[PDB]
Design a binder for this molecule. Structure first.
Ligand SMILES: CC(=O)N[C@H]1[C@H](O[C@H]2[C@@H](O)[C@@H](CO)O[C@@H](O[C@H]3[C@H](O)[C@@H](O)[C@H](O)O[C@@H]3CO)[C@@H]2O)O[C@H](CO)[C@@H](O[C@@H]2O[C@H](CO[C@]3(C(=O)O)C[C@H](O)[C@@H](NC(C)=O)[C@H]([C@H](O)[C@H](O)CO)O3)[C@H](O)[C@H](O)[C@H]2O)[C@@H]1O
Ligand code: NDG
Ligand code: NDG
Ligand code: NDG
Lengths: 160, 324, 324, 160, 160, 324
């Protein structure tokens, strides 16, 4: 990861999380579970969707394209015609594979960044009220119930 | 009490490549490359394609006896030639600017064939019933092109003929004709009398003169002689005039062309079906919304862009780390 | 005491697009796409363009009677044809390799027009005063091309003529001529006596022979006959020889070409004005430093690259969050 | 943003700052005002100017390019020529629009990165002498006058 | 640097380190020296090696490409032929130079990202057992011998 | 005790460019642009190239007297013409579809020259020993092309000749011939008797008639007459027939062609050397694995992609800061 979060200081993902890409676990005395962060997840979904559509917008549709025949005395223009078809094909194949490779790299970084920003966000909310255990978990000092855990998720909490 | 921050994971096996790492398993992704077709030649815009089958463009437009199946067809989504489209000019010769004509037909979606010079009324002073050859058989009997009329001398007389047609169609009229070159001077005489015959053809733009070239050529389909074919597009309101003292294989049927859309000719050995599509390739129809395809560079209709890729998959989700 | 860290923000309404988000307002940005032009045809390299107006290249080089306004022009930065450039070959016929000649003019900055075959002294044995036609009228009366000379027989005689010219200019010399084809053999005699006349043209590289093709073709501009136009570029030092026993529409004026810089012919109805520019398009001139323009694919001089884009703006500053 | 600063933990910009892209506010007892950080602003300016120039360097100028004419028996080469003009036109339109798109994304992340770096810089300078209020502000413990505020800006300060 | 590490809070490299791209210095009472982090350096090599390999894959080889001749009445197809040759030549030159430029930016950012992550990793490992001196150095409190320094490197250490 | 985290640095001077900054010294980098070549013309697939030297394609195939060095060669990896390949058609005239013929040869890796029409046994009733000209001298004395046979009348009689050759080599056979055009009818008669001679050539696909065009053209190489050259590719099993009443410059040697691989003709003055290579340019061979080269756009074999770039270097290491 380019931002150290995914596959970084947060070694793995949660098959348990099932309502978004980024979320919380929380093991409060009342119980355990998973809750996905909407803010993060929807923003990411909006961007990647826009990214995919952008890629598709740029690529032109292909209409009717049919070959031409040449007689035995027109080998030069026939080869020229083929050099043109082969040329653009090689170019577009290159453009398509390169754009997908580059964006795939960006996309994974984008997620890594989102997780990271979520961590740092939840971290600056808690401060002294909890310690960083690592693996992206925060252990509270003052005990936090479900009513309280929820305040952390929707960025309210507050208590320097 | 603890609260952790994490990310999604699942049982997806989808993989993608990136600049720094190949074969990365991810949670979600979209395939942008279409690679499936139905292996059939379908209709576009509800119009069936024109199956030339055993015939090629030359044979179709000239009316080669072996292409009678095509006679009643005059509307198509696209023209299809197969690997065995060998039926063209059954009488040996050169088809002038044949490729250009094929090119012209690529923007012709339909036409109206009409007997430009009726066979039983256009040539009172010339023989109209002996223009057949074993080179263009039909049912085992010597025959000829359906859309051309081979004229010969009548009672040892071939008077200078002059015939004109005024394009009354309100559109382009493709006119085809031929000039026959006998192998010997004696054949020239038995056919047209005039040792030094000539054929003249003209309009407001077209203007060319033809001279018989007598000589025995290596036989093709039993013929030592040769027959060259010509065409031209007569513009609306314009006039085409034929003058000849022999050797004219006169026009019989002509075509009023209708330009219509990016259509064309394709070479395919795939079969036709009661099938509809928006995208047609020489291997079969594509029904897809993806931006890319590697089925075939040749398409007709609205299709994904052709690309030589084997795989084009975008990661939408994130690195899948089930950590099971 | 407090100290904060922040970022600039203003009232800019500028927006740009990114992979992830569209229409993002930013503090500063730079437009890279040029979409303005003055709607005028200005001069390049400090020289005005050649305005053909009612004439097309053909009319200009042959000297169609209706193109006399151009007879004095001999230098230009580019050529302009209009929607009404129909004055060309007033006598119906084919202009051989016309498109090639036009291409050849691309880099011609000017020429030295000269009377290669002085009318009143080059043909002592042929009629030089009856080569007019109602097809090429001037001031109501029948006339002809100014740069060609239609020779006809003198006193029932048309001797084999032979005229040569040695390219002494130290540059290419464009020579144009015509070959006439009467509609009937009686006109062929009225015109040139010799029933079997021919025209021969030769240089070190050029060699061609023309034979009259008599026939009554559909009338165009009153003519049932036809006139074909030919040309060739004579190299420095080479010699061109014309031989003929009839039908030769002899060269009168020829042109010594001077090569300038990549230029060309454009079609436009925009007005020419006393004005200058480094970049000209059929719609108007461009004055820009921007790398792109969506004005016109056709350009002359130095221009931003043509692109079909609507908008091309790069963000230079940052996301504009006035948070008002 | 990819770095969480701009439109992140520093919710907005200062219409007030007017001598640079990145800067300081400071509300010392003596007074209040805005002072842009040169180091950063100029560096960022140099980078963006270089990016813009590079984009323009790669894009070739266009010299004389006119149309070609063809007779009625040259439909094949005419179409070849048009297939060529359209092909390159689509390729360059593609490159131009795509380069701008990608760089615009890079640029905003560049600024986002810069602000982030500036904050972490001003932060590691203060340490114990102030506390992180969030929103990018630092509240001093030992009080800091105009002469002290400036020391922070020009990375001098020093006092663990 | 986009991440603030290289040429940032860690002003310079170590001509001393010679067994990797990212390493540790350590000045324990027993001695001093340099040790490169394998985990990091090798991951970086694999990635950069794949990057170069990917770039080379995309660029198609070039087989037999020989000119054609045209007589003096084929200036239009000759120019068409040249417009196609210069056309593809310009396109690929643009593709080559542009890919290199962009990937070079990304490569340095990659390293910067790696250094930063290594710092933050060693950092969250020590916590209280040492203090941030800056320049990327940590000053232990409880004194750390060679056997101890090696525990930090191989991410074992552990001692909140 | 202290532990620090840093990054490598060395004395590398390597520099690379980035979007945001130019000339950035890094620790490690790879060059992607090959710019070295051995300045020599090497062999490919172990086969030597065909050095035409002073001759060009025409002079070689026709068998120009000054190209005897090439006579024994029948296999090559590529064809090379120099800046002095001016030996082609010694006798003035036009080489019909010459560029096409050159294009055809680009896909010919070898051939088998054979005497299609043995000189001493194919023309019993015609003179086969006077076909020489001072325009095609050899060792001071007038000579002629080694592969064609200029036939002339035998004792005031040029009977109608007819000669056929059945392609029986199992591959395309390149046949070349010429049609001579005397400057005057007096020459036409001293050479071929018949004043109205003609040459006819036919196969299953080829069919052309040639007529003498007598006229004094500007002398080239001392010749006021012209000789036109022709060729065709006779397909496997096909027959080619020549008919003439004069003016025919008959085929003597023909070539059975072997298509090989993508090969070609290059123009170079670089020397040929005992050497090998997988990649060859007109400047010299290349021995490299790099993806790009800026040596030359023209290449034969397996080469890096041509590019106009001056420098292409990717940083692999990191910004080098020895901070010395
Ligand atoms: C060459 C010519 O003038 N052709 C005319 C043609 O003229 C004939 C007429 O004068 C009779 C009268 O007795 O005599 C013919 O014959 C002699 C014969 O050849 C000779 O062997 C024998 O010993 O004596 C006889 C008697 O002298 C003439 O040939 O008449 C027809 C009918 O009117 C003309 O047709 C119509 O022509 C129109 C065009 O006319 C022009 C033009 O362009 O305006 C007049 C120009 O003066 C003429 N240019 C010349 C001579 O340079 C051209 C030119 O002939 C054509 O372009 C050639 O193709 O013609 C228009 O075409 C209309 O539609 C026709 O019906 C015919 O042109
Ligand atoms: C008129 C005509 O073209 N008939 C021939 C036929 O004789 C021949 O057997 C067949 C082989 O493909 O081709 C054509 O059909
Ligand atoms: C000699 C000539 O070309 N004259 C015609 C003129 O008669 C006609 O009215 C005009 C219409 O476009 O075209 C040309 O000017
Ligand atoms: C038969 C023949 O081709 N001879 C000429 C020779 O006379 C001339 O000096 C040389 C110049 O390049 O060209 C040819 O070799």
């Amino acid at each position: 990861g380019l931002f150290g979060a995914i596959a970084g200081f947060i070694e793995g993902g949660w098959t348990g999380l099932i309502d978004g890409w980024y979320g919380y676990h929380h093991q409060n005395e009342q119980g355990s579970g998973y809750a996905a962060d909407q803010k993060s997840t929807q923003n990411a979904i909006d961007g990647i969707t826009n990214k995919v559509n952008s890629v598709i917008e740029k690529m032109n549709t292909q209409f009717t394209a049919v070959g031409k025949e040449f007689n035995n005395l027109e080998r030069r223009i026939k080869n020229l015609n083929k050099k043109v078809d082969d040329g653009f094909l090689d170019v577009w194949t290159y453009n398509a594979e390169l754009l997908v490779l580059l964006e795939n790299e960006r996309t994974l970084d984008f997620h890594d960044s989102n997780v990271k920003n979520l961590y740092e966000k939840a971290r600056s909310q808690l401060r002294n009220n909890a310690k960083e255990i690592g693996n992206g978990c925060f252990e509270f000092y003052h005990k936090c119930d479900d009513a309280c855990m929820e305040s952390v998720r929707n960025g309210t909490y507050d208590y320097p | 009490d603890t609260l952790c921050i994490g990310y999604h994971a699942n049982n997806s096996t989808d993989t993608v490549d990136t600049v720094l790492e190949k074969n990365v398993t991810v949670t979600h992704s979209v395939n942008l490359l279409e690679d499936s077709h139905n292996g059939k030649l379908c209709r576009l815009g509800g119009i069936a394609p024109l199956q030339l089958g055993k015939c090629n463009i030359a044979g179709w437009l000239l009316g080669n006896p072996e292409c009678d199946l095509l006679l009643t067809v005059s509307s198509w989504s696209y023209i299809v030639e197969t690997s065995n489209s060998d039926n063209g000019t059954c009488y040996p010769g050169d088809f002038i600017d044949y490729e250009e004509l094929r090119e012209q037909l690529s923007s012709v979606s339909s036409f109206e064939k009409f007997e430009i010079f009726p066979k039983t009324s256009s040539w009172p002073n010339h023989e109209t019933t002996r223009g057949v050859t074993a080179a263009c058989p039909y049912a085992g009997a010597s025959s000829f092109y359906r859309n051309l009329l081979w004229l010969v001398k009548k009672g040892n007389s071939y008077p200078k003929l002059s015939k004109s047609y005024v394009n009354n169609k309100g559109k382009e009229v493709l006119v085809l004709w031929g000039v026959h070159h006998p192998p010997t001077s004696t054949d020239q005489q038995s056919l047209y009398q005039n040792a030094d015959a000539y054929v003249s053809v003209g309009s407001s733009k077209y203007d060319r003169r033809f001279t018989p070239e007598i000589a025995a050529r290596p036989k093709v389909r039993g013929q030592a002689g040769r027959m060259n074919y010509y065409w031209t597009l007569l513009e609306p309101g314009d006039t085409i005039t034929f003058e000849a003292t022999g050797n004219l294989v006169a026009p019989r049927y002509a075509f009023a062309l209708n330009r219509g859309s990016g259509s064309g000719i394709i070479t395919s050995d795939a079969p036709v079906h009661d099938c509809d599509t928006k995208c047609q390739t020489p291997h079969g129809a594509i029904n897809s919304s993806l931006p890319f395809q590697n089925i075939h560079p040749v398409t007709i209709g609205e299709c994904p862009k052709y690309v030589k890729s084997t795989k084009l998959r975008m990661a939408t989700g994130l690195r899948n780390i089930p950590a099971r």
